[model samples]
Target: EIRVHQGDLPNLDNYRIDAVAVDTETLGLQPHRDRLCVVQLSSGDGTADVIQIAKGQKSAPNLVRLLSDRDITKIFHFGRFDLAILAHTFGVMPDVVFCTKIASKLTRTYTDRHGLKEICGELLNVNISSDWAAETLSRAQIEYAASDVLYLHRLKDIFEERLKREERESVAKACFQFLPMRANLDLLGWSEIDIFAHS
Candidate 1:
């Protein structure tokens, strides 16, 4: 079962704004704008679904709800933005996220971006491009979002097994729980970063 959840751009003009600005101001920038589509997959059947939201309505709580009862053994390619987006916009925190991004770094595999799509592409021979990253939503966009989650769902199985074999599942869980809760320090430094770098 696959479910894709999308959020629509508030207006057509702000399409190119940086995700940083959009997420920071909740001004419906690229990240949360109608242009951005966030998808979540169900651990039960590995099916995926998406949510489409506008500028004013944040899905932070919705994301948390999805994770509330679910038991995630491992999440491939994790990062700060995953939870940051939810907390900044929807006021929800990801209970656990074993970012393959962080894990790759820990394992000393590749020190580059370490993005989930990139990691999955390299590890699983799947290519996920943000070709229409900020482009308008359409049939193609839906397909893009679905493909991402689908690959991720599969990647999780591979990565989860890898984690168990490596005996780092416990550490990965600790990282996930630590990321959002201890994010107070991270949040404080957001302003110091190049907030508009992506703009």
Candidate 2:
């Protein structure tokens, strides 16, 4: 279920998908300093595409178009950082976003761990390896990247059901709606500084 698309994704525009699971691998956490090396996407069709991006290249018309398409919801785990990274590297901001990490935080009130690894293990019974080296992306690395995005749709579904059961579905929706603005805040240098915190 792993397909490697180099430079640009072929025939991506022809696909009619409502939501796509997205994940990115960067050189570092700092968008300005780190290079966006790869982008992985899945439409929950059991197939995932890992697009390898070259350094110093700015144009990814199809990828940008897909990400910017308002009709499509971009699903991510920790989307705040991914959104900022994509916007900074490719000049594209995804319109509608569903963040699984945020959904877990709002729904899984019993635990502090909401990361993809933990969620996958607890909810999906899958353990994903995070040991892939960013600089040297091998076949295993590509598959690992694919794994990161492949289960997001299912995870979102699980989270959504839990949200509804907990009677916080509307609240979770509100958080998802505000996620893009939250990404903007991260880009604006307020990522670590919680403005909502009262001193």
Best candidate, TM-score: 2
Candidate 2 per-residue lDDT, tens place, 1-199, comes to: 7878778898775347988899998878888787788899888988888888887779898899899989988999899889999998888777699999899899888999888898999998998834333445687787778888889999988988898898998898788888888888888888887777894
User: Candidate 2: minimum summed lDDT over ten consecutive residues — where?
Assistant: 129-138
lDDT of 1 by residue, 78-186 (tens): 4465455555555655554556555666553545767766676677887774434333456766665555455554555566677778888878677666766544344
Question: Residue 171: error of model 2 in Å?
Answer: 1.2
C-alpha RMSD of candidate 1: 9.5
Lowest-sum lDDT 10-residue window in model 1? 17-26
List the global CA lDDT of all models: 0.48, 0.84
Q: What's the TM for model 1? A: 0.61
List candidate 2 segments past 4 Å from native: 129-136
Which regions in candidate 1 have their CA more than 4 angstroms from the true location?
1-39, 42-46, 58-64, 70-76, 108-113, 129-136, 182-184, 190-199
